[PDB]
Each structure stands twice: as structure tokens, then as C-alpha cells.
Amino acid sequence: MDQENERNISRLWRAFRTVKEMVKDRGYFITQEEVELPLEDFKAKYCDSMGRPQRKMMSFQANPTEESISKFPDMGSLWVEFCDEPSVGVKTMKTFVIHIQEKNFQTGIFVYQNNITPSAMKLVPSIPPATIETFNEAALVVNITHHELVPKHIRLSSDEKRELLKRYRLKESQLPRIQRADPVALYLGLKRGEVVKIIRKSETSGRYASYRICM
Amino acid sequence: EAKKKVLDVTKEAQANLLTAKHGMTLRESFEDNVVRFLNEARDKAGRLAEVNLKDLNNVKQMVMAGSKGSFINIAQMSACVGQQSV
Amino acid sequence: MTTFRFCRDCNNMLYPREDKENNRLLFECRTCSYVEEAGSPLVYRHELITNIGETAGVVQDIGSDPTLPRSDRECPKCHSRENVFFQSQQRRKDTSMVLFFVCLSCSHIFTSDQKN
Amino acid sequence: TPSLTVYLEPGHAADQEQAKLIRSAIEHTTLKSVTIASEIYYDPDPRSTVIPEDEEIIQLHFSLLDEEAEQSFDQQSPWLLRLELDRAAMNDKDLTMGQVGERIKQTFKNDLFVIWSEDNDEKLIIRCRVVRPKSLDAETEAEEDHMLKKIENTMLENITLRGVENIERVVMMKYDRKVPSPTGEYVKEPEWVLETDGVNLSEVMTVPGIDPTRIYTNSFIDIMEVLGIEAGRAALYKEVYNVIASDGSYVNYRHM
Amino acid sequence: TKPRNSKNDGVDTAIYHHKLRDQVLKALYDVLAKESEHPPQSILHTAKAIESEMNKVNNCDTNEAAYKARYRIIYSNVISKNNPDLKHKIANGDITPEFLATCDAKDLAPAPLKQKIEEIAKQNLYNAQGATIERSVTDRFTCGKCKEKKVSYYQLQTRSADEPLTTFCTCEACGNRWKFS
């Protein structure tokens, strides 16, 4: 039992928990017990006799809650799948794309270990209206949203956006803006033209609410 | 007495007996000790000279009222100027 | 401690070479036919950090420098009480403040740190 | 002067030992830093030497090498990286001689094999002998020094034993937090923190044994890249307020 | 008369028909019996015990790297000429085979190297500390946050020379800072 084995196992377990937290934060249905799964059960289930982490059995499908469907009628099921290869080949990406398309899933999460070939990512935007998003493994070990300096963000519906825009009597190009590559935007999976509300603490009033638009 | 303390620290450091402080070179330790000793000496002398003064002193009256000066000015004009730095 | 060796013909430094059939090291001059037999397998040396004791530097005629201080410490060899004293003349950042004494008569060097 | 302040876990906060383990696990360690004499020496026949000190180490591994090493005896370079290694520097980073000295080094490119002693010898001597195929060209095989000096420099400079890149120094410090006591009032409680000299926030954040929710740096661009734009705004506010208020001046909050 | 060893003492080393085990037993028996006057039978029994412990605590077929590392550690400790007393103890039985199985590298060292090791550890732990900025202590100014008069000071000619010196007072009990001019 070389130390690198359990080091990699622990980091992979951390990434799995972080991905579960992200999927829960996107409005889906995930139990609290499943989030707090101890590493012993993780080793018992997702490791072979030799201790090799069997990533391929971790792929799972998630469905939205009642509240998320009520707020977002267009929201649909999501699929997440891990890749065992150190580098993702073109054939593997094509197989994943075909699997997502035949499952008729609106969005999917593809977590890769080290690198992806350019021809593989050539196929990312080729399946409308489905959306394919990639997350490097080394960047999901620690949950960003749990920091002290990151306030709490919320997503707004079309009706809420229209009501705010009317009440403040504004055109969408005058609100403050947030980029796409912004880490919290990737976490929440915001597309172009969506408004995110921010709740923050303040020395002068206690609580304060700001708004931003994804450009 | 401050001069004697500084001289004793110099004697200790010249015999390779002085110990370097936390994460900080030996020369810096010697310099730090000397500077601290001299500054405390100046402050204490200033406070003695300030406590001596009566209530019918005009400079003390101006300082007490809050209009012009402080105890540093009294210390330099009366007790001692101190350590010039660059 | 590797030492430069010069060829006896044209004063050029000798480059190393190997002798496979006898398996022995030689020093040859690339300009002439001189070849000499190596006496040790030590040809080059590359140290990284210098554990050198601090040195007083040049000592010759140091007693005629009138800007150098004095002391009344007693000589350990000639029992004289007049000498010159100064700090280490090597300008490293981390050098300690250990003195050096040069006796006036016997020109003997010693230090104020008498570590056993 | 970029910097980075790391706060340890709640359990390890009050004890110095776990703090020093983390400090060793963060700082960047490279071979050139741990050799008191990484001396390039002539090693014509590695079978035997004139120096008595390395002679004792000779018979250790010569009775401790596998059959493949016995076959590869001829691959060892006619020059040696003779490593007199400093005991203090090696023990400072909690660096075991064998595992760290050889596992990663031979795994990287299968370029340099070693005859190494156990740490108990009074003089820690490693014999770094590079490994090359015998199929090397005659002109190549003649120029032993030419290949080996270059590969020795690339060996010292470009091998990382342990740590994270760009972090020159990591230093221990003691601070005084204020915490609600169980009876309800606020009490002063000491804690151990690590302050670096150099910033690499993407990799320090994932090192186990620290608090990944209280890390901070005085380089708000990195915080903007890693944590978001509101986090960058908060960090920028802290920087501006710090620089203004470090002079004792007071400027109302609305302006800043 | 002759250096005692497996070939000299005429003791068979092939008991478990394992090549690696056979050669490591031969080597350890030879190095143990070379400079020991103890009878060879108990030496062979101790060798059997230690090799059985090595095999049982770690299978060579699955952990050959760790097996080789442990064998190298023990063998280097045995050959170590700085501390000959150990080859007495293993001959005498003072050091149990399980202790050698579980012990780390440091404890097998002699006393002087041990002491040097703790001294080095203490020096490193002292050298990993940061610069302590100890400020001048005084008891005249009153802090506005905790009102503890243990407030340090620092005064300098920094403002324009049209005005007197400027002082800055920092409370060492709570962290408050202020300026007087």
C-alpha cells in the first residue's frame, strides 16, 4: 500500500463530494447523507480488490426537485460521468456525446483527469440544445463557495428579472456584469444573459442585496 | 545605565556568546537591542523631566490646555535629544 | 581539492583522458605529444556552500595603519600587552561579530572566542 | 512583495508539530538546496575507491543490488555526482534518504541510478551514477564529460524532491484570535499560522491539513482568478482600507 | 582460524526453496557469524525467526519493494561499524526479532547519533520561527478599545518640519492603533 494510492484516493473522494455539493446547489435533489458519505464506505464500494478507484461506476443521473421545476419549468435531468484515461481521446468524447444524445439529456458533466485533445473538445458545442461542460479534476478538490469571502448568490427567473427591470426602470446594459469564466459562474452554470442576485454583509446596514448580469 | 546596558550587550556579542533572535540575523539582533535600549532611555528621562515641572510653568500650561506642543518637545528641550536615524 | 596541472612543453593546462586497454587515467596536452600519468582519481571538484572560517585577511605591516584600534589584552605566546584588533575583513552578510587580534611584537593572530 | 497567509485546521491549531509538518509539506525543496557537497567527481571505476569513507558504503549495496543492477554495473558514469549531504537540511524537511532520494528521481525519466547509504552513517554519502544504454555512439561514448556535466546541471536544477513551486519561504507565526467562550463572553486564544514569501494559491489550497476556507493573500488578482469577482472586491477593499488606516487616518466607509 | 560463514560452518541455507530468501539468509548469517563467537545453531535459529517474521509481516510476492527496503535497512544496520554492540545483542537475544521488524531507522542508531538527531531537530524547530516585532513597553497612554495601558509607542520626525514630531501608539493587548501630532 504505497502512500500515493491513498493520497489519490482521498483527493478523488474530495472531488466526488465537491461535485455532489455542486449538483445539489444547481437545484437538484441530493440527500444530506449521500453528501456526508464517509471515506470507508467509499473505499468499500468504489474500489476493487487491489484498491484501484473504479471511476466508471460513479456516473449517475440526477433529477430536479419540485421547487426547482416550479421555478424553472424548462429544467431537466442531468448526467455526470468520470473518465479513467489520463487523456481523453476523440473516440471517448464521441461515445460520451452519443450516450448523452440518445439519453436525450439537456446537460452533462464530463470530469477529466489531466488533458483533453483539441479534436475531442471540437465536439462540445455541436449538440444543441444540450450543453456539455468540463471540469478539470485538480480544480474540484476544494469547494470554492465555502470560502469566507464568497457571498451567497442566487439565480433569478424570467418573471423576477422582468419585475426588477421594470421596478428599477432599467435596460439590461446598465446593470453591473459578471463574466462567463468567473469561477462562481461555472459553479452555477450561468449562460449568457442571466441575472444573479448577491446577498452580502455590511458594516452600515447588516445585509445588502446586489445584482449582476452574465455577459 | 542605558549606556552600560548597551556596552554589556556589545561585550556579549563580541565573544560569540550572543544568540540570534527568531528568524533574524545576529547583526540585526545586536542593532535591535541597542536601538531599543537607547529609545527607552530617552523616553524615561523625558518623563522624569516632565514630572518635575510645576503648575505655574507656561510651557506645561500650553501643553495641558492642548494648544501647542507635547511631552516630546519638553523632553528634547530639557532632558535629551536622542538617537538620530537615517 | 582539484588542482590545475600545466603541460611541461607549452604551459597549457592538461586535459584528462582514459586508457582502456590498461584502464588508467592520463593527462594530455591537446597541442603537443606530452602525456603524464594521473596519480589520483580526483580530477574536478564542485562544492556548493563554503564552510570557511572567517579570516583576518592581509596581515603584513598591519601595525602601521593608524585608523585601527588598540587593546591591552595579553599575548598568549610572547606575553605582550600591546596589539591591534579588528573585525573579520571578509564582507559576508551573516558574519558574526568575532574579533581578531594581531600582536604588535610577534605578529601572532588569535581571536576573542576561546572555544575548546 | 507578494505573500500568502495560511490558517491551519481547528485540531492542529494549538500544537506546533502538525504545523511544522504542514510547513515542510508546503515549502519548495530542490536537490541543489540539500547538498553540502554535490561535487562532480571523476568516477572511472565505481567498483572501488581510494577514499575510506565511501568504501564502507561500497560493500553495502554491492551485496544489496539485484541481478539487473549487476548487469547494469557498466552503465554507471565514469563521473560521479558524489553527494555529501548535510544532515540538518535533510532532516529539516522530514526527507527520508531512500524513498525521496531514489523513487521519484528514477521514476521521472529512468535517468539516474544511485548507490545510497542508510542515514546512520556519520557522513551521508550518495553516489549518483547516471544510466545510459551501451548502444551509445563511439563519438558520443568518447565525450563522457560533455554529456554528464550538462545532465548534472539539469539534474540539480530541474528535480523537485517535495513542495509546491514558486514559494521561496514559509514561516511559523503565533497570533491571538478572539473567540466566544462557552459562558458567552469573548476570550483571547492563541493560534499557529504559516506566512509565506511567494504566492501560488491554486495548489496551496488543496494541501490536506489546512483550513481551505480561511486562506488569504495580498494579491487580489489571484483571488479574482480563483474565487470570483465579489471575493476580489472584498480583498481589494481590505487592501485599500489597510493602506489608508495604517497611518491612523480615518475615512468614512461610503467613500472607499 | 577461518572466517565463520555458511560455507565455512557447513550449514545449509536452502530450507524454504526460495531464491531470494535463500540468498538473504545466507548473507545475513554470514555477516552475523563472521565476527561472532556465539554457537552457530542458535544464530541459525534466530535467522530463521527473523526471516519468518519478515515474510509474515510482508509478503515478498506482493510487496517486494518494501521487502527489499526493510532488508536493506536491517542489513545496513548490521554491517554498521560505528555501533558493533548490536551484533552482540542480536547474538545475545537482547533485541527481539519483532522489535527489529517494527523499529524505525533512527532508534537503531547509537547514542551519540541519537543525541545529535534531537539537537538538530530542536535547532530546526527554533529556526522555523518568524521575526518577533517586540515594541517598547510603556504605561502612560490609555487605549480606547480595552483601556489596558500596556500600549507600545513609536515616535519620529515624519510630518513637515513646520510642525513637531508625530507619535503612533499601538495597544499590545487588543490591537488598537492611533496617532498623536
UniProtKB/Swiss-Prot annotation, chain A:
Claim: Nucleus is one of the keywords in the record: yes
GO cellular component terms given for this protein: nucleoplasm; nucleus; RNA polymerase I complex; RNA polymerase II, core complex; RNA polymerase III complex
Predominant location: nucleus
One of its GO biological process terms is:
transcription by RNA polymerase III
Its domain of life reads: Eukaryota
Per UniProt, the keywords (alphabetical) are: DNA-binding, DNA-directed RNA polymerase, Nucleus, Ribosome biogenesis, Transcription
Gene Ontology MF annotations: DNA binding; DNA-directed RNA polymerase activity
Q: Which family does it belong to?
A: Belongs to the archaeal Rpo5/eukaryotic RPB5 RNA polymerase subunit family.
Record PANTHER family: DNA-DIRECTED RNA POLYMERASES I, II, AND III SUBUNIT RPABC1
What does the function comment of this entry state?
DNA-dependent RNA polymerases catalyze the transcription of DNA into RNA using the four ribonucleoside triphosphates as substrates. Common component of RNA polymerases I, II and III which synthesize ribosomal RNA precursors, mRNA precursors and many functional non-coding RNAs, and small RNAs, such as 5S rRNA and tRNAs, respectively. Pol II is the central component of the basal RNA polymerase II transcription machinery. RNA polymerase complexes are composed of mobile elements that move relative to each other.
Q: What is this protein called?
A: DNA-directed RNA polymerases I, II, and III subunit RPABC1
Protein's gene: RPB5
UniProtKB/Swiss-Prot annotation, chain B:
Residue location of crosslink Glycyl lysine isopeptide (Lys-Gly) (interchain with G-Cter in ubiquitin)? 11
Modification after translation is described as:
The tandem 7 residues repeats in the C-terminal domain (CTD) can be highly phosphorylated. The phosphorylation activates Pol II. Phosphorylation occurs mainly at residues 'Ser-2' and 'Ser-5' of the heptapeptide repeat. The phosphorylated form of Pol II appears to carry, on average, one phosphate per repeat. The phosphorylation state is believed to result from the balanced action of site-specific CTD kinases and phosphatases, and a 'CTD code' that specifies the position of Pol II within the transcription cycle has been proposed.
Compartment(s) where it occurs, according to its Swiss-Prot or TrEMBL record: Nucleus
Q: How does it assemble?
A: Component of the RNA polymerase II (Pol II) complex consisting of 12 subunits. Interacts with DEF1; the interaction is direct and serves to bridge RPB1 to the Elongin complex in a DNA-damaged dependent manner. Interacts with the Elongin subunit ELA1. Interacts with the Elongin subunit ELC1. Interacts with ASK10. Interacts with ESS1. Interacts with RTT103. Interacts with SHE2.
The family this protein is said to belong to: Belongs to the RNA polymerase beta' chain family.
What is recorded about the domains?
Answer: The C-terminal domain (CTD) serves as a platform for assembly of factors that regulate transcription initiation, elongation, termination and mRNA processing.
What is the designated name of this protein?
A: DNA-directed RNA polymerase II subunit RPB1
Q: Which species is this UniProt entry from?
A: Saccharomyces cerevisiae (strain ATCC 204508 / S288c)
Q: Which residues of the full protein are shown?
A: 685 to 770 of 1733
UniProtKB/Swiss-Prot annotation, chain C:
Q: List the disulfide bonds.
A: none
- Per UniProt, which keywords does this protein have? DNA damage, DNA repair, DNA-directed RNA polymerase, Metal-binding, Nucleus, Phosphoprotein, Transcription, Zinc, Zinc-finger
Zinc fingers, TFIIS-type, are found at 71-111
Q: Which GO terms describe its biological process?
A: maintenance of transcriptional fidelity during transcription elongation by RNA polymerase II; RNA-templated transcription; transcription by RNA polymerase II; transcription elongation by RNA polymerase II; transcription initiation at RNA polymerase II promoter; transcription-coupled nucleotide-excision repair
InterPro entries in alphabetical order: DNA-dir_RNA_pol-M_15_CS, Rpa12/Rpb9/Rpc10/TFS, Zn_ribbon_RPB9, Zn_ribbon_RPB9_C, Znf_TFIIS
| Gene3D superfamilies documented for this protein | 2.20.25.10
User: GO cellular component annotations, sorted alphabetically?
Assistant: nucleolus; nucleus; RNA polymerase II, core complex
- Give me the residues that bind Zn(2+) 2, please: 75, 78, 103, 106
Provide the primary localization.
Answer: nucleus
* Cellular compartment(s): Nucleus, Nucleolus
List modified residues, type Phosphoserine.
Answer: 40
* Positions that bind Zn(2+) 1: 7, 10, 29, 32
Zinc finger (C4-type) boundaries? 7-32
Q: Which SMART domains match?
A: RPOL9, ZnF_C2C2
Q: Which CDD domains match?
A: Zn-ribbon_RPB9
Any one Gene Ontology molecular-function term assigned to this protein's record: nucleic acid binding
Q: Where are the transmembrane segments?
A: none
Source organism's superkingdom? Eukaryota
Q: How does it assemble?
A: Component of the RNA polymerase II (Pol II) complex consisting of 12 subunits.
Q: Report the family membership.
A: Belongs to the archaeal RpoM/eukaryotic RPA12/RPB9/RPC11 RNA polymerase family.
Additional notes on this entry: Present with 2440 molecules/cell in log phase SD medium.
What is the recorded name of this protein? DNA-directed RNA polymerase II subunit RPB9
Report the source organism. Saccharomyces cerevisiae (strain ATCC 204508 / S288c)
UniProtKB/Swiss-Prot annotation, chain E:
What ranges of residues constitute the TFIIS-type zinc fingers? 139-179
Gene Ontology cellular-component terms listed: nucleus
Which is an annotated GO molecular function term of this record?
RNA polymerase II transcription regulatory region sequence-specific DNA binding
Could you confirm whether the keyword Methyltransferase appears in this record?
no
Q: Does the keyword Zinc-finger apply?
A: yes
Q: Which UniProt keywords apply?
A: DNA-binding, Metal-binding, Nucleus, Phosphoprotein, Transcription, Transcription regulation, Zinc, Zinc-finger
Predominant localisation class: nucleus
Location within or outside the cell: Nucleus
In this chain, Zn(2+) is annotated as bound at: 143, 146, 171, 174
Q: Which family does it belong to?
A: Belongs to the TFS-II family.
Functional description taken from the UniProt entry: Necessary for efficient RNA polymerase II transcription elongation past template-encoded arresting sites. The arresting sites in DNA have the property of trapping a certain fraction of elongating RNA polymerases that pass through, resulting in locked ternary complexes. Cleavage of the nascent transcript by S-II allows the resumption of elongation from the new 3'-terminus.
Q: What is this protein called?
A: Transcription elongation factor S-II
Specify the taxonomic lineage: Eukaryota, Fungi, Dikarya, Ascomycota, Saccharomycotina
Could you say which residues of the full protein are shown? 129 to 309 of 309
